[PDB]
Structure formats: C-alpha cells, structure tokens
Amino acid sequence: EQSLRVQLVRLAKTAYVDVFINWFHIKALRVYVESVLRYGLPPHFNIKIIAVPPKN
Amino acid sequence: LYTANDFILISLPQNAQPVTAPGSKTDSWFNETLIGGRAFVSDFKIPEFKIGSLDTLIVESEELSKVDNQIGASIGKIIEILQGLNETSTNAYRTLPINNMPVPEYLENFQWQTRKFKLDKSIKDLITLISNESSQLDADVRATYANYNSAKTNLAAAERKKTG
Amino acid sequence: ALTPNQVNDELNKMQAFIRKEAEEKAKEIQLKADQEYEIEKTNIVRNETNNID
Amino acid sequence: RLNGYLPSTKNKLLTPEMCDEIRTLMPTRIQLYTEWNLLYSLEQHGSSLHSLYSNVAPDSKEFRRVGYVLVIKDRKNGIFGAYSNEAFHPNEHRQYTGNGECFLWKLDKRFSGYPYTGVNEFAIYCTSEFLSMGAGDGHYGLLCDDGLLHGVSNPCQTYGNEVLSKEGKKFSIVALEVWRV
User: Which cystines does this chain contain (chain D)?
Assistant: First the structure.
C-alpha cells in the first residue's frame, strides 16, 4: 500500500504530462483542419488563445 | 467564487479587421477594447501540416471529433483518479506544471514535438499513431488503477482479519 | 467565378503533390547517397585491405 | 529503482550496475517499469544475423512504447551500444524507420552519451546485410557485419558522437547482447 501508491503517483504524473501533450496536439490539428475547410488556399491564419477567468 | 482559467482557440484570416471598430487593428481590440484586460493575448504556432485530401477532409474532421471526445473522456477519468486518490488538491491545482513549468506558460510557448511526431507523414498515419498511443496510455493507466484498487482492498481485508 | 474556385483548389492540390513528392524524393536520394557511397566505400576498403594483405 | 534480468546459465551476461547507470537517459514512462528481458544473445543463440532478426520479432502490440537496447563488447573489452525504440528488421529502401529520440553511449565501470540531434535523420537503417546507426559524411556511426565479425564507428551529424570502439575506424566483435524494455 506504500510502494504501489508511489508507483501510481509517478505513472499518473507522467501520464498527465504526455496525454495532455497529445490533447493539445489533437486540438492543434483540429484548428488546422477547420481553418482549411472554412477558409481558402493559403495558410495565413491568426490562431490566438484568449482566457476569460471570471464567469465571462 | 471560482477563479476559472479557461482558454478559447480562435483563428482568423490575415485580413481580419473589426467592422464594429473600423480602422483599429485586432491586437488593439485585445489590448484596450477587450472586455477590460482580464484576458491575455497569446498566439498558437501551427506547423505547415501537409494536407492529405480535401475529399476525405469531412470524414477526417468527424473522426477527429470522435477521437477528441475519446481522449477528453480518458483525461477526465485520469483527473478523477488523480483528485479522488489524493494525488492533487480537489479545490484547485487540477493541472500540473509540464516540464516543471505552468501549463498557461506552456500553451503560449507551445511548440510541436518534432522529436516524436514528424511532419513528413500524412494526416491518416499521424491520426492513427496518436490514437494508438492514447489507447495504450489509457489502458496502462486503467490497469494500474485497478491494480492499486486491488492492493487497497487487500490492505482492507488484512485490517479486517486483525479485528473482530 | 464558379469554375475558377475549383480550378484553383485543384491547383493548390497539384502544387502540393509536386512539392511533397519533390522533397520526399530529395530526402530519398540524399539518404540513398549516404547509404550507397558509404556501403561502396566499406566494400572497396575491404577489398583493398584484403588485396594488400 | 531496480532492474531484473532473465539469462540462462551462460558464461557472460550484462551487469546490474550498468543497467542502473544507463537507466538515467531514455524517454520517461519507460524508466518507470523496470524488468529487462534478454531478447537475443550471441552465446546461447548462435552467431547468425538472420537468427538475431528472427529472434527479435517486432511484437509491439502488447506495448508499442518499448525501448530496445543493444550492448556490444569490442575486441579489448570496450563496452558500448545504442538505444532504439523500434525493432530491427530488413525493410524497403524508402526511408529510415526511426524516431528522433535514440542515442549512443560508451559505458564502463564512466558513462557517456550522444543524444539525437535535429540536424538530420540518417542511417537509422536495417537490412539483411548490415545494421548501422547514424551516419553522414564518412562511414556510419555504428555498424555490424552480416556475419557479426567486424564493425565500424565514426562521428556523424545524426548524433555528433565520438569514436566508440577501442579500435576506432574498424574492429571485431567478441560478444553481443540485446535487451527489450
């Protein structure tokens, strides 16, 4: 109950790292494909992130 | 009050200008004509992925949405395990600093991982391999969580045999 | 301008194909260079070493 | 923080201290689970390259995130090798099958390393006649004969590595082991 807890901690943290990286990669591909579909020939898209913390 | 820190991904053409505020550049709209400066402007760098085929782009988009839903659910279960098992604080600090540095700084400084994922591959094989890796990590984490559940149940039984 | 839209789409596509195939060929042939001249140097140095021995 | 082995009553195997030392440098999520497996050897599997390739079946379905480690002892006990993430097997000449995260190393009782660089992706190659690591101008960074008798090692752009073998330009093989993780 001590050892497995630490091993689970380690595997869970490395997972939260790599899976999250893949998650952002997937969303990057999503935005790219959506921009390709909706827009025209050349890529000159202004991909920005705006964070609205308070209830907005 | 919940001090949320959420992020919205927006893409616009190169000639994107505000008709509501004509003659004003977009950056200024995010700097002074924003909702009040609560948000911070950051850009997302997208490497020039080679387009596979517009004919399959619709099926590609829908399968992309499916895999995105699957990975979102898997990460949801991951965070549920993390919070429930005392791995992270329930109230906040749900995220962790990747590379020992905060996620908000990572996304603004986000860059494509050329080491593992190569841009020379088409969309089909790239999505195949990313789905495969997500599946493998999900299976391994689920198996480990079940193993630790068995371990804690074994400890509970060991406690029970002591008493009574 | 109804057909020109799809014509330019097919353009974008065929320029993409010709480019992509050009770069993949370029890498193919530089890797083939490394391979071929290195194997050739190895074999020739081998058959020169044996001859001198 | 420990490693295990699975040999079978042969003269020479690898040391646990060496594996503990090498464990430092490789992608995360691999160092965590630590049970090394002897996939092939030179003593108790003959001395045939074809036997090596047959023994190392690209069975990645159970775990496609598996590290492949090749350890080779040169003529004069100079130990070294490299780490690979993909199983070795002859392929069509199209492309080098290799992730840009492999590395080389010169081990001893004095560890070193040469992580993959983004300059290029060369000589991560696999064919029925040879099995060589990063290369470029000049011969390959690593090389083993079809017959597992002589080898070549030289600096390369793919790794910028130094000369690994005690006999730098070319040498001879005396014992080889392969590990899967």
Answer: none
